Design a protein around this motif. Structure first.
Motif, PDB file in Angstrom:
ATOM      1  N   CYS A   1     -26.988 -42.101   7.026  1.00  0.00           N
ATOM      2  CA  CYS A   1     -26.722 -43.016   5.880  1.00  0.00           C
ATOM      3  C   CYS A   1     -25.747 -42.351   4.877  1.00  0.00           C
ATOM      4  O   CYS A   1     -24.902 -41.554   5.290  1.00  0.00           O
ATOM      5  CB  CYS A   1     -28.051 -43.519   5.250  1.00  0.00           C
ATOM      6  N   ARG A   2     -25.826 -42.670   3.570  1.00  0.00           N
ATOM      7  CA  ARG A   2     -24.887 -42.189   2.538  1.00  0.00           C
ATOM      8  C   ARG A   2     -25.205 -40.761   2.058  1.00  0.00           C
ATOM      9  O   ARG A   2     -24.339 -39.888   2.074  1.00  0.00           O
ATOM     10  CB  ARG A   2     -24.886 -43.205   1.378  1.00  0.00           C
ATOM     11  N   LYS A   3     -26.449 -40.527   1.618  1.00  0.00           N
ATOM     12  CA  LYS A   3     -26.883 -39.268   0.977  1.00  0.00           C
ATOM     13  C   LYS A   3     -27.452 -38.256   1.990  1.00  0.00           C
ATOM     14  O   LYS A   3     -27.151 -37.062   1.914  1.00  0.00           O
ATOM     15  CB  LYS A   3     -27.921 -39.616  -0.108  1.00  0.00           C
ATOM     16  N   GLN A   8     -34.148 -40.578   5.109  1.00  0.00           N
ATOM     17  CA  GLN A   8     -34.727 -39.800   4.004  1.00  0.00           C
ATOM     18  C   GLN A   8     -35.640 -38.646   4.497  1.00  0.00           C
ATOM     19  O   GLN A   8     -36.825 -38.576   4.159  1.00  0.00           O
ATOM     20  CB  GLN A   8     -35.393 -40.684   2.919  1.00  0.00           C
ATOM     21  N   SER A   9     -35.073 -37.735   5.306  1.00  0.00           N
ATOM     22  CA  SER A   9     -35.664 -36.437   5.686  1.00  0.00           C
ATOM     23  C   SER A   9     -34.602 -35.321   5.597  1.00  0.00           C
ATOM     24  O   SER A   9     -33.822 -35.063   6.522  1.00  0.00           O
ATOM     25  CB  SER A   9     -36.404 -36.495   7.036  1.00  0.00           C
TER      26      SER A   9
END
Length: 19
Positions: A1-3, A8-9
């Motif tokens: 994704c972006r970040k 989110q890991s």
């Protein structure tokens, strides 16, 4: 994704800390 690459890991909680 972006970040993060996976989703989110990574480090989490906003894209850095200050901004």
């Amino acid at each position: 994704c972006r970040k993060a690459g996976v989703g989110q890991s990574w480090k989490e909680n906003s894209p850095l800390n200050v901004s």
